[PDB]
Symmetry: D4
Subunit: 150 residues, 8 copies
């Protein structure tokens, strides 16, 4: 990867729906070269794919909660818990964090009931779970994980 | 939005690079109808855009940290802090959470030095900040914010 | 329910001992209509009943305590604990709260001894209880759960 | 107050809509005596009034939250804060608790927005407030403050 | 007990080595009456005994520590733990406290080694103990438990 | 101080009301020697005095509370706070503890009101106080500060 | 040990590579005496040895972490855990601390992966471990354990 | 640096008092080469110096404490505090840690008094200090910061 690639990625991370011609005219290089560079970035896994950015509000994903999970030490219990947490519907992010030493889980649902039935009641029964603490999001000031190049 | 739209969105949230023909053959509807439905979803803001999903590791975004920020009460100091946090380079997520009552900040950097210079040292000088606590991510089990339809 | 009902409920939540005539003269509607509307609110369960508001001090309910209960995760142990907590004499409120993720219990007794014997010693032996923390109320600034319409 | 009064209060705390005749037949005393005893209990302030018990769900009071408030020490700042908290719409209970040494606030709203606008944003600007912590109620197992005699 | 008794107790709590004549001349009553009143206070257990107040420093009781003990819930485990804590040499005070809901233990030793061997290592092996936290006293500003009448 | 002194102190810490003859017969030494040794222990300040041990219950000292006080750093504010805490009526013990780094205050009162008026409301107004936390004693398992020799 | 020894130790703790002649000229004593005094300090174990001070940065020891370990009470489990912690590669310091009552572990590694594999994953499986909390060092302001004489 | 250097450093970190001949015979290389390699390691700053390892117990460094310091946010106040902490006599280690976000201070003294006078009372007056918490070391299981190569 060279500086040309960064300029390309810095544009695609925002809008992957530009024409090659428009991107070409912006970074000043042949469309054949641009097209070539994009293809290989994909091949080398720098670009893992293209997604449609859907507004969660539009799906009534109103009940947003960030949960901290403390796991029961022993083996084993740890990684095992990470994977059980990641397969719960509505959970889009699971992180093993230092600190505190436990898991941070990002999940979205339409209502309280849904959250309770799909997330809460389910996590309550997992064996390897010592204790959890939820932090309800009342306001999203920013959420742009797509922006990796500042 | 009807069930047909959900089927469309459930595919686009994964791969927005399918051909209309392939999506049409999958959900069984005229390409003209599919194309029409997608265009309006965009118009109604359900689909806010299309992004290239870039692998953070490929950019050496190694120092991942989740920071909790406690703000000084008064006015005012609150929203003000949210916006100052959101404009810091490397910060992609800022949430005002209940709970705890404070802000959860998601940020990525290549190294410790970068994190310290771009995030730490900067947050340390913000007036409205009472105290912060960082939780270093040592392992990402899952990160797919693009998946809104389970 | 319409605005007329709200005006009625806003009065009954305070004093259910007014005459229909007095309420009628206040909201300007036939007593037969008022009487009809009240009867159906009761039928539809909006009005669950009428209670006498008794001053707790008059019964020497001096030892007021708000207890937080952390439950042992597994199944099951959760709901089970909620119900065991709710049947303890002197306990009038039990809430499953997010946050913290555990139960908030409101209880009143005449003395410390009573509290210890009826609440403390009993909760100490419940299997599903991990740990509890009590917050003694030294002053009630306000307690009007009857007011649902502000 | 004698044991006869307790039997009366133990019934009125449940249903203040019984006929004097029915209560009389239950506790075995002249209706004139019963009527007399009730009148004086009211006079001596044991019975402060009669309320209609309204189902909060019926009013869409969905966003229930228990907030802990830590106050800035000095004077003065304390009682002052108690009263400012008690006059906020939606707040039905405010307690000064030992423990922890701070205030426990019970409040109900229809939604998150309402809670934020009526409670959150307002408490954030109060001078005497050091910090707050909210515990969202996801389930009410029991709420019968009307029951003072077990 | 009357006001005369309080005047007597208020003197004896300080110095039980005054002559009856000197106390008599101070509160203005016959020595026979004073002597009589003291004898009965002892009989009724108001005065449980007379002790020599020994300076702990003089015994090299240098390592003073206040320990909080969290007990494992179940039965039973509670009171049982209180008594095991009270029989440990060097422990002069054990309190079951609300709050926090656990035990506060006051203990004095000559050195760190002694504290570790007599208290620490011993408490570490008690079954009913969940966890403990010690607060080392680096300065005694006041310690006059003998003063009950202010 | 020699072993003979310890034997003497070990008896006086319990009951200072024994006759010299009885103590003499117990440790096997001339009454003149015993009397001499006691006199000098007093002179050297090993024995600071003799007190009457009064049962706190007998004075209705029912509201027992152990308070932790966090002080505002600066100078100065520290020692200053220790002394202000020690002169509050009902406070018999004040300790500066490591740990936690703050003050542990032992106080007794007859009721909640007294505690609030004499202790609470007073500490709330002290400038150098950052925050406090009270732990209500619901049971005294042991309180024998008079025993310094085990 | 006398003041002459302190002067010697105060120099050797800094630079053990001075010539005896240079140290002799500094403290003003015969080289034979100096040499004699050093030899015996070593014999009496005051001087346990001479080490080369290696810069950790030069070995890419970048991931520095201070971990707090809470142990499961019972016996036994305690000391046992101390020794298991001390034999983990990369761990140079293990302390049993009061306070908090648990272990403080100092460890250094080159990267996050190394830390996770050599420390984290290993501690996660130790039976006697209740829970741990890591504090990542982002800046070493000072680290001179070699300086014992100030 | 090559593997030969590591073998050399791995020996010098333990005992810098071996003869070049003995080290040469161990790693199998000419003494002239060994001597050359050591000289340059020193020049490149890999080896910063040679110290005498002094037993702290031998100096009666009995009062060992690990203190956590929370600093007042603003500027500036941060680094400033780090340096003020590092110049306090008895303090050998100061670390700025993530986590928690504050400073970890390692200090040793002979007694409690010394600790209070040299460390405590001094830190209490520093302006930029919000609060501190001390963890008394009652047992050093391991302390070998000199070992950088495992
Ligand atoms: N986009 C462009 O201008 C490139 C045109 C074409 N790829 C070429 O050969 O230059
Ligand atoms: N994709 C399709 O088969 C649709 C074809 C075209 N839109 C039509 O008129 O049917
Ligand atoms: N309260 C009233 O005035 C109503 C009277 C009666 N219900 C009617 O027919 O109007
Ligand atoms: N409720 C009753 O039976 C009482 C009747 C009436 N008060 C009487 O004189 O007895
Ligand atoms: N102390 C006194 O003066 C009392 C003297 C004696 N008890 C009497 O009969 O008065
Ligand atoms: N208590 C005694 O027996 C001592 C008596 C007296 N002091 C003596 O000269 O021995
Ligand atoms: N370093 C010195 O000057 C000491 C010399 C030699 N040890 C002597 O006999 O004095
Ligand atoms: N230590 C050794 O054997 C090395 C000897 C000498 N440096 C040489 O020329 O080989
Ligand atoms: Mg994307
Ligand atoms: Mg009611
Ligand atoms: Mg006494
Ligand atoms: Mg060294």
């Amino acid at each position: 990867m060279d500086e040309i690639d960064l300029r390309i990625l810095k544009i695609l991370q925002y809008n992957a729906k530009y024409s090659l011609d428009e991107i070409a005219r912006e970074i000043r290089i042949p469309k054949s070269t641009l097209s070539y560079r994009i293809k290989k970035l994909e091949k080398d896994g720098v670009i893992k794919g293209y997604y449609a950015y859907i507004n969660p509000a539009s799906l009534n994903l109103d009940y947003i909660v960030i949960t901290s999970v403390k796991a029961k030490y022993g083996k084993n219990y740890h990684v095992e818990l990470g994977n059980k947490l990641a397969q719960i519907p509505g959970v889009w992010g699971v992180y093993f964090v230092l600190g505190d030493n436990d898991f941070i889980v990002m999940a979205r649902y339409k209502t309280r009931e849904e959250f309770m039935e799909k997330f809460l009641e389910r996590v309550m029964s997992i064996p390897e779970v010592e204790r959890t603490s939820a932090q309800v999001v009342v306001k999203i000031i920013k959420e742009s994980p797509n922006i990796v190049i500042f």
